[PDB]
Amino acid sequence: KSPEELKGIFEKYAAKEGDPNQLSKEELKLLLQTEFPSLLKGGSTLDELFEELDKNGDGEVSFEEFQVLVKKISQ
Structure with missing residues (x-):
């Protein structure tokens, strides 16, 4: 996914907890x-x-x- 899409995703999962700018483990887990x-x-x-x-x-x-x-x- 493009950096833009990845931002969209980041925001989605971050915001899903509440903090828009920072992902906890759980947001990462659901994201992943x-x-x-x-x-x-x-x-x-x-x-x-x-x-x-x-x-x-x-x-x-x-x-x-x-x-x-x-x-x-990327690697």
């Missing part, structure tokens, strides 16, 4: 389950993936640091 069910395991198991994506180290994943996932996809 719907759009990329492999990636729940693939590359890294969800919990580890979350840490890997959360470069800023707050816990929850912003659209910017979420680009690490898109990088992984």
